Design an enzyme around this catalytic site. Structure first.
Site, PDB file in Angstrom:
ATOM      1  N   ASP A  75       0.660  -1.215  -0.175  1.00  0.00           N
ATOM      2  CA  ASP A  75      -0.090   0.054   0.081  1.00  0.00           C
ATOM      3  C   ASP A  75       1.063   1.120  -0.126  1.00  0.00           C
ATOM      4  O   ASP A  75       1.916   1.415   0.795  1.00  0.00           O
ATOM      5  CB  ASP A  75      -0.821   0.176   1.131  1.00  0.00           C
ATOM      6  CG  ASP A  75      -2.040  -0.881   1.211  1.00  0.00           C
ATOM      7  OD1 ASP A  75      -1.997  -1.940   1.484  1.00  0.00           O
ATOM      8  OD2 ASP A  75      -3.234  -0.556   0.659  1.00  0.00           O
ATOM      9  N   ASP A  77       0.859   5.648   0.148  1.00  0.00           N
ATOM     10  CA  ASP A  77      -0.032   6.576   0.549  1.00  0.00           C
ATOM     11  C   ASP A  77       0.337   7.959   0.061  1.00  0.00           C
ATOM     12  O   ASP A  77       1.524   8.406  -0.115  1.00  0.00           O
ATOM     13  CB  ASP A  77       0.134   6.834   2.229  1.00  0.00           C
ATOM     14  CG  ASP A  77       0.102   5.517   2.927  1.00  0.00           C
ATOM     15  OD1 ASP A  77      -1.002   4.849   2.878  1.00  0.00           O
ATOM     16  OD2 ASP A  77       1.268   5.095   3.365  1.00  0.00           O
ATOM     17  N   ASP A 126      -3.464   4.708  -1.501  1.00  0.00           N
ATOM     18  CA  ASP A 126      -4.691   5.200  -0.786  1.00  0.00           C
ATOM     19  C   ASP A 126      -4.386   6.789  -0.964  1.00  0.00           C
ATOM     20  O   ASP A 126      -3.080   7.261  -0.656  1.00  0.00           O
ATOM     21  CB  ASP A 126      -4.418   5.246   0.761  1.00  0.00           C
ATOM     22  CG  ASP A 126      -4.734   3.752   1.283  1.00  0.00           C
ATOM     23  OD1 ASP A 126      -5.599   3.208   0.483  1.00  0.00           O
ATOM     24  OD2 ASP A 126      -4.219   3.167   2.271  1.00  0.00           O
TER      25      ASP A 126
HETATM   26  N1  LIG Z   1      -1.115  12.041  13.290  1.00  0.00           N
HETATM   27  C1  LIG Z   1      -1.290  10.806  12.673  1.00  0.00           C
HETATM   28  N2  LIG Z   1      -1.114  10.401  11.208  1.00  0.00           N
HETATM   29  C2  LIG Z   1      -1.373   9.492  10.662  1.00  0.00           C
HETATM   30  C3  LIG Z   1      -2.010   8.434  11.510  1.00  0.00           C
HETATM   31  N3  LIG Z   1      -2.216   7.133  10.834  1.00  0.00           N
HETATM   32  C4  LIG Z   1      -1.582   7.612   9.469  1.00  0.00           C
HETATM   33  N4  LIG Z   1      -1.437   8.964   9.516  1.00  0.00           N
HETATM   34  C5  LIG Z   1      -0.485   9.412   8.527  1.00  0.00           C
HETATM   35  O1  LIG Z   1      -0.659   8.724   7.327  1.00  0.00           O
HETATM   36  C6  LIG Z   1       0.655   8.405   6.704  1.00  0.00           C
HETATM   37  C7  LIG Z   1       0.688   6.933   6.231  1.00  0.00           C
HETATM   38  O2  LIG Z   1       0.048   6.335   6.993  1.00  0.00           O
HETATM   39  P1  LIG Z   1       0.734   4.608   7.353  1.00  0.00           P
HETATM   40  O3  LIG Z   1       0.325   3.876   6.208  1.00  0.00           O
HETATM   41  O4  LIG Z   1       0.002   3.994   8.606  1.00  0.00           O
HETATM   42  O5  LIG Z   1       2.307   4.835   7.586  1.00  0.00           O
HETATM   43  P2  LIG Z   1       3.614   4.065   7.003  1.00  0.00           P
HETATM   44  O6  LIG Z   1       4.690   4.906   7.126  1.00  0.00           O
HETATM   45  O7  LIG Z   1       3.280   4.200   5.303  1.00  0.00           O
HETATM   46  O8  LIG Z   1       3.423   2.840   7.285  1.00  0.00           O
HETATM   47  P3  LIG Z   1       3.100   1.233   6.742  1.00  0.00           P
HETATM   48  O9  LIG Z   1       1.911   1.546   5.506  1.00  0.00           O
HETATM   49  O10 LIG Z   1       2.597   0.514   7.639  1.00  0.00           O
HETATM   50  O11 LIG Z   1       4.452   0.956   6.002  1.00  0.00           O
HETATM   51  C8  LIG Z   1       1.517   8.387   7.820  1.00  0.00           C
HETATM   52  O12 LIG Z   1       2.935   8.539   7.558  1.00  0.00           O
HETATM   53  C9  LIG Z   1       0.781   9.872   8.724  1.00  0.00           C
HETATM   54  O13 LIG Z   1       1.313  10.901   8.196  1.00  0.00           O
HETATM   55  C10 LIG Z   1      -2.445   8.431  12.889  1.00  0.00           C
HETATM   56  O14 LIG Z   1      -2.958   7.546  13.513  1.00  0.00           O
HETATM   57  N5  LIG Z   1      -2.037   9.705  13.525  1.00  0.00           N
HETATM   58 MG   LIG Z   2       1.601   3.250   4.707  1.00  0.00          MG
END
Ligand SMILES: Nc1nc2c(ncn2[C@@H]2O[C@H](COP(=O)(O)OP(=O)(O)OP(=O)(O)O)[C@@H](O)[C@H]2O)c(=O)[nH]1
Ligand SMILES: [Mg+2]
Length: 342
Positions: A75, A77, A126
């Site tokens: 995934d 982002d 996403d």
């Molecule tokens: N403040 C805050 N930001 C969030 C939260 N969840 C997601 N985000 C934001 O959304 C971004 C993408 O979320 P994630 O997919 O969970 O982060 P990731 O570093 O890509 O982690 P993985 O997908 O597990 O590799 C993060 O870097 C944050 O900027 C949260 O619970 N609190």
């Molecule tokens: Mg992520």
């Protein structure tokens, strides 16, 4: 050499086996740029309203792993910064969902804070729409849809993390050569400065590789959890704070596991919840959604201590491989132990 010591080497092989593979990695940027092109097309509600498009989360910090529950899906982002009249967070998500209508992917799913694009090949996007609120790059808000806006600066967090994790030449060259070789590709670089653009660095930092293993450990311990899981941005923040040049991989993985575990322990001792601010935007807390209760955070701390304590007992490897399978997954550990055997 990151493959000389057996524990460091098997952990490196494990990390290679949870990366975004080179063929997909080489497609990721064009994939989200094609999404931007589509939502900017004539007739789209967001025509002329896109200020910029940028990766957040793992893609921003070269930390992408296989996604929780899987070994072969991923995934990404992406933030779409949207301009024009602000009529509330639900209407902003409505516009993004409408602009992505009939986008030729496997499925489009509207989420609470983003629109998800599922792709046939297993690398999904996403798309989070944002509103800029301040001049600092890129301080603003994202929608949650009672519907509300949530302050964030994921752009500056990504840049902050990258500044704390400069590329480590010997480590990066070794692990990337193996990552690419496993994919049938010759990675031919003597120095990180002149890597052939066709085979760019995917892995750059021991700190990030340790963070990827922390996330993998989290993904296994919470593989089927439908409730809230420990958030990766909190784990990525702690990894940035824990960054230390020249540290070996096992040592750094133990350090990061104990960093988060001890922070939880200290809050729990006071009947408080873990608090982790965004270093670049302190009003944003990476702990705003997790933990919700003492049980949630103390459960995760116990998992982290078990991980750290077992890796430390190993530093001081057929019993280790079994224990690794429980921590990181049966099939991935089997594939890594095979590579370390050769
Ligand atoms: N403040 C805050 N930001 C969030 C939260 N969840 C997601 N985000 C934001 O959304 C971004 C993408 O979320 P994630 O997919 O969970 O982060 P990731 O570093 O890509 O982690 P993985 O997908 O597990 O590799 C993060 O870097 C944050 O900027 C949260 O619970 N609190
Ligand atoms: Mg992520």
């Amino acid at each position: 050499d990151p493959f000389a010591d057996p524990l460091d080497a098997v952990l490196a092989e494990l990390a290679i086996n949870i990366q975004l593979p080179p063929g997909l990695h080489a497609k990721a940027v064009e994939r989200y740029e094609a999404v931007r092109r589509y939502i900017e097309r004539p007739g789209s509600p967001l025509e002329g309203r896109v200020a910029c498009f940028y990766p957040q989360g793992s893609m921003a910090i070269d930390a992408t792993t296989s996604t929780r529950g899987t070994d072969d899906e991923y995934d990404l982002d992406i933030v779409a910064e949207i301009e024009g009249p602000d009529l509330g967070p639900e209407a902003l998500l409505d516009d993004l969902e409408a602009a992505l209508e009939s986008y030729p992917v496997s499925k489009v799913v509207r989420q609470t804070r983003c629109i998800t694009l599922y792709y046939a090949d297993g690398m999904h996007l996403d798309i989070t729409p944002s509103r800029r609120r301040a001049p600092k790059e890129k301080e603003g808000e994202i929608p949650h849809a009672p519907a509300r806006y949530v302050p964030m600066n994921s752009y500056a967090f990504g840049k902050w993390y990258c500044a704390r994790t400069p590329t480590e030449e010997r480590f990066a060259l070794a692990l990337n050569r193996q990552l690419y070789e496993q994919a049938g590709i010759a990675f031919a670089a003597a120095d990180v400065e002149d890597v052939p653009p066709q085979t760019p660095l995917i892995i750059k930092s021991v700190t990030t590789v340790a963070l990827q293993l922390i996330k993998r450990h989290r993904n296994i311990a919470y593989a089927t959890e439908t409730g809230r899981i420990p958030p990766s941005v909190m784990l990525s923040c702690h990894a940035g704070h824990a960054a230390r040049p020249g540290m070996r991989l096992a040592e750094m993985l133990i350090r990061q596991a104990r960093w988060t575990a001890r922070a939880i322990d200290d809050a729990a001792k006071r009947g408080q919840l873990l608090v982790v601010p965004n270093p670049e935007f302190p009003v944003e807390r990476f702990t705003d959604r997790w933990p919700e209760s003492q049980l949630q955070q103390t459960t995760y701390s116990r998992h982290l201590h078990t991980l750290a304590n077992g890796l430390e007992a190993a530093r001081t490897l057929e019993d280790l491989q079994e224990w690794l399978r429980g921590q990181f997954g049966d099939r991935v550990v089997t594939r890594s132990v095979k590579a370390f055997n050769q």
